[PDB]
Structures are given as structure tokens and as C-alpha cells.
Design a protein around this ligand. Structure first.
Ligand code: FE
Lengths: 338, 340
């Protein structure tokens, strides 16, 4: 009734699937915060969907924009009370940030990584770039090592915005590392680091039918793909094809910020049915991305009905781990952050 | 060579899939702890398979039993040195226990749940029973709440030796609760608790397997099924059948203690291909199970090379959350299990 009217207005603004739950996640988020970034964060719906919901609400008189905040009109408060939609709570563990692992034991690694990455290459708009916080990076090392995927393993880093490979060198855990990125700024920076650190067993390389040096040679890959079905499949699929065989691990990040749960379902059928891998871990908001400098240039910025820069790291991704088994094999509308 | 000889000897003892990684996980675990239960824990391989690997290792001189501990021999030290297998590290967050959620805000609920559950029915061997820690229970409530799946929601609890339906009553969050279990001791206990708490909107059912009263009527379900593909398919799929439509949630535990990753792959194909649901969260060791009193009568005890009672809660399951989408549909003991 109330809800129907909203849903059809949202459908006129986006072809991203829209459910009553979409609207409800947004309304729950709005009750807990007026900040558009944190609304996207807390609703766990993709930015362009959130915008189309908040916009529909504002057109149909349930939300107001006021003080650069998204707030419920009196009509919106009748809506949430009528549907029993409470303010979204969050009980994320304040020690691990919900990562499940503590990094107390990697404190000097953290310090070093922080120091060495002070002059890191600034994220480039045309490589869809952004890097995770050094804390995330070190949490990544602690996570991988706790699943037995680092020590004396051969590790392939497919894309390295985050400079995970520099953290891996400083940990001293891998037998060897291979890293690949399109951006020559990164690969030069990594090589300079390796050469000065004296890490010998690292190959750097600056997308199609894998070379000899990659194919079936690694124990573990990490990647953080662009957020499309095709790119997730390409990148994760190529990661899997680097793996020696059964018993090998893959790590990658998938967001709720740019991918809807309908997308997730297609991604999960690729992993399970095209690659025949098993998903061993899916950890909410494991990856915290540092806010990037080219935002005013992005579609997300043009979509926002309130132009305000984010005041915290609103953009996070879930950590996926996969493992290979017998038979495993390797190889949009919801997007806005380019 | 060493590895091949160990794998072939393990294959003579189990029909569970065996990989080099299997042997590696066990050897890595053994270097962190000699306690058999902790080895099963740390290795994240199914208990009967860890027993087979440890026996095969023993038979061939790579491990010994000393002071009730599994330890590497000199020959075993040379094997791990050769394959570069270090001791398994564990960095589980010490404050949340790796649950991702903290429960400081539910300390009232916790004491209340502990007090109400002091005299709960003892886990019956004939059913598959073990209950999670009170802390697990409340962390479940915090997780479900933080995902927007409790407050003013209709919640179906399918099986409840954990007494989640009781913690849910004390939380006051749901609009209503339905619970089903075979064990009439449990449903009696939950009725009484509903009566004393004076929670009025709970429906309790006591029977085995398959109503109007469940089908397409709930927002959220929770269940903790027996660990076979068929049981997971039936329990989780029934759970999905209680859901209204898209946008609804279910929660359930799956163990690495009693299911191999090969089994995990079949389960995940069920969830994605037969039910068409999406997996939103898979959280390692979220659920901590209270050691159960009938242990000496189980298959696990009988298989153990050393018959020592566990000194800690070694048995844990991953939390899975799923969500329904357009087109999702529901449903209309085995080789790797051993808690019997
Ligand atoms: Fe924590």
C-alpha cells in the first residue's frame, strides 16, 4: 500500500532488483543515521539502489533532505512504525573491527608497513583504484596465515593497489611471491621495495590465456576484482588457474556497495558450478578502503542527492576465501565508484 | 614419496577424500598441540579423517603417543621440515571469539538466559544433541539483530536444543516465535519458560518430520541441522519453505568437524542451485558447543587412539546466513560424522 507505491517509484529509477527488503534496509539505515554514506554502509544495498530508494521516498513524501541529512518526514515515521522497521543496530566487535582476527602479534609489521607505504602511489581514477587501510592489509596477512596459506607457500597477488605483496615481504612468511598489476607506478614501487629490503623471491609483472610462469604454480592467490560478474569471474577464474591443484586457497573481496545480492547469487553459481571451488569464509566488512581522492569525478558523486564528502571510511568489502578440491578449475548498473 | 605413502595408507582406512592438504593441515596442527581434540579443531578436517591420518602417521613412524599427546618423532620432524609445514597459528580475536559481534550490550539478556537455562534438559544421545554456550546464544541474537532479522519479525526455530527460542523471548525483539523439536523434554521446557516469562506470541510443536502454520509465514528461520547433505537439504530447505518470499533470512551451523570441504561443496550447490538462495555470511567457529555427557558412547570416542575427555569446548560450527531472492525455493549420520 504505502510500500507498493514506493516500490514502483523505485523501479522507475533503476533496473537493479528492488524488494520490500531493499526499502526496509534503507529505512532502517536512515533511522540510525542521516549521513548518506553511512546509509549506504548500513543498508548493505548498492549505492545506486540506495539513491533511487531515498529519492523515491523524498518524492513520495516519506523523507526530507534537510541540513545535508536524509531524515524521515512524519509520514516516513508512520511508515516505519506501521511496518515495525526499527533503527539498524550494529554490534561489530570493536577490537577486531569484525575481521575475526587480532593483529597484536603483527604490531611491528604494521608500523613498518605504515612507514614504507607513506609515499605509495596515489589511487588513479582510471584504474578504479583504492587501497585498504594498513590495518586491513595486516589483518589479511594474519587471516591467511591462520588458515595455513602463507608460510613457505608460493603466493600470487593479482592486482596490488593495496600493496599486499609489500606486507608479505615484510612478514617473511612466503617461499615466494608473484605480483601483477597494470599500473606501472605500483610495480615500480614494489620492485624498489623488494630490492632495498633484499627480498629475492619475488617476480613482478606488468588479463588473457595465462603464461607459463603463472599456470598451476601457486599455493594461494589474492585478488580484489572490479565489481562485475564478468570481471569477478575473469579475475577469480585466473587466480584459480594459477593454483597447483586441490588443497590451494584463494582470497578476494566482494562488496555490497556495488553489487546487489542478486549479483552475489550469480557470482556464487560461477564459483560453485563453473569453477567447482568451495567457499570456506565470507566475512562482513573485513576490508576497509581508505577514501580516494578522485571521488568528485565519479558517477557515485553525480548520483548523490546531497554532495558531501565522506567523513569516515564508508566503503568496505567482505572477505571471501575459497579452496580448491578434486575437479576444481579456473578460467554494470550497480557500479558507481569510477 | 613420504607424502604418497601416507596418503595411500590413509585411503586404506577411510572413504573420505584425502588430499596432500589434508595431511598438511593435520601435521601443522600436531606441531601446535598434541591434544587430539585440539588437533581436530586446528586442522579443520573431519574427526574420522584426522584419526585416519594420525593413525597412518603413527603406523609409519612419523608420530608417537607420549603422555597422552600426539607428537612428531624425529622422522616426523624431518617430514615437516622437508615439506615446509609450520605449526598452525591462530589469531582468533580474543574479545569476540571470532564471532565478529560483541555482546556487552546484551549482558542483561545473558545473565537472564544463563539463569533460566540452569536446569535445561540434558543432551540426549538418541537425538543429536548438544547445546551451544550461552555466549554463543546471545551472540546469535546480536548477529541476527544487527542484520535486521529479529525486531518485529516472525521467527521460526527449527530444532532447539540450543534454546534459542528462549533467548529470543527474553530479548523481546520478535513479533512472534514458532519452535519445533522432536524432543518433548525441550518443548515442555520452552512452554514453561514462555508461561513464566509470560511471552504470549510463541507457538510450540513437538514432533519428528514432514504445516499450514509454517508455510510461507515467517521472516527468518534458524536451525542447526545434523551433518549430512540430506539432512542439511531437508532442514535448511524446510526453513526456506517457512519464509514469506524474497528478502527473508535463515541462519544455520555447518561444521568442519563432521563435514569435509567436498561435502561443503555439495551443500553449497544445494543452496545455490536447488534452493536459489544467496550466502551472505560464513563465519568460522561462531558456534561453540558445550561438551556433552554421552561422549563415551559415541563413534568419535571409539575411533580415538587415545580416550581422553576433552578439556575445552573443541567442537565448533561455522555460522551461515542465507537470504532469499526472486525465484528462491525451499524443500518439499554419515561417513564423516562421529558424535553419533
Ligand atoms: Fe573481535
Amino acid at each position: 500500500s504505502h510500500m507498493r507505491e514506493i516500490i514502483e517509484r523505485v523501479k522507475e529509477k533503476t533496473t537493479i532488483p528492488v524488494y520490500e527488503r531493499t526499502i526496509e534496509n534503507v529505512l532502517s539505515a536512515i533511522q540510525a543515521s542521516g549521513d548518506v554514506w553511512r546509509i549506504v554502509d548500513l543498508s548493505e544495498e548498492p549505492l545506486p539502489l540506495v539513491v533511487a530508494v531515498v529519492t523515491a521516498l523524498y518524492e513520495l513524501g516519506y523523507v526530507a533532505f534537510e541540513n545535508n541529512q536524509v531524515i524521515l518526514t512524519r509520514k516516513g515515521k508512520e511508515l516505519v512504525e506501521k511496518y515495525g522497521i526499527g533503527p539498524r543496530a550494529d554490534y561489530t566487535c570493536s577490537h577486531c573491527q569484525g575481521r575475526t582476527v587480532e593483529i597484536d602479534a603483527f604490531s611491528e609489521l604494521l608500523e613498518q608497513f605504515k612507514e614504507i607505504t607513506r609515499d605509495r602511489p596515489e589511487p588513479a581514477h582510471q584504474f578504479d583504484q583504492a587501497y585498504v587501510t594498513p590495518e586491513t592489509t595486516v589483518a589479511r596477512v594474519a587471516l591467511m596465515h591462520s588458515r595455513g596459506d602463507l608460510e613457505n607457500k608460493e603466493v600470487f597477488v593479482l592486482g596490488d593497489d593495496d600493496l599486499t605483496s609489500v606486507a608479505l615481504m615484510l612478514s617473511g612468511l612466503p617461499k615466494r611471491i608473484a605480483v601483477l598489476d597494470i599500473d606501472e607506478r605500483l610495480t615500480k614501487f614494489i620492485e624498489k621495495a623488494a630490492d632495498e629490503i633484499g627480498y629475492e623471491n619475488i617476480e613482478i609483472f606488468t588479463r588473457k590465456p595465462l603464461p607459463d610462469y603463472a599456470l598451476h604454480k601457486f599455493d594461494t592467490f589474492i585478488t580484489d576484482p572490479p565489481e562485475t560478474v564478468e570481471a569477478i569471474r575473469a579475475f577469480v577464474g585466473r587466480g584459480i588457474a594459477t593454483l597447483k591443484g586441490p588443497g590451494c586457497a584463494g582470497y578476494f573481496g566482494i562488496t555490497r556497495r556495488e553489487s546487489s545480492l542478486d549479483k552475489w547469487r550469480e557470482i556464487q553459481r560461477v564459483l560453485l558450478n563453473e569453477f567447482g571451488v568451495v567457499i570456506t569464509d565470507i566475512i562482513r566488512n573485513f576490508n576497509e578502503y581508505v577514501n580516494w581522492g578522485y571521488v568528485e569525478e565519479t558517477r557515485a558523486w553525480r548520483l548523490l542527492p546531497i554532495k558531501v564528502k565522506p567523513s569516515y571510511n564508508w566503503y568496505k568489502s567482505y572477505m571471501f576465501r575459497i579452496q580448491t578440491l578434486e575437479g576444481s578449475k579456473g578460467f554494470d548498473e550497480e557500479s558507481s565508484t569510477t
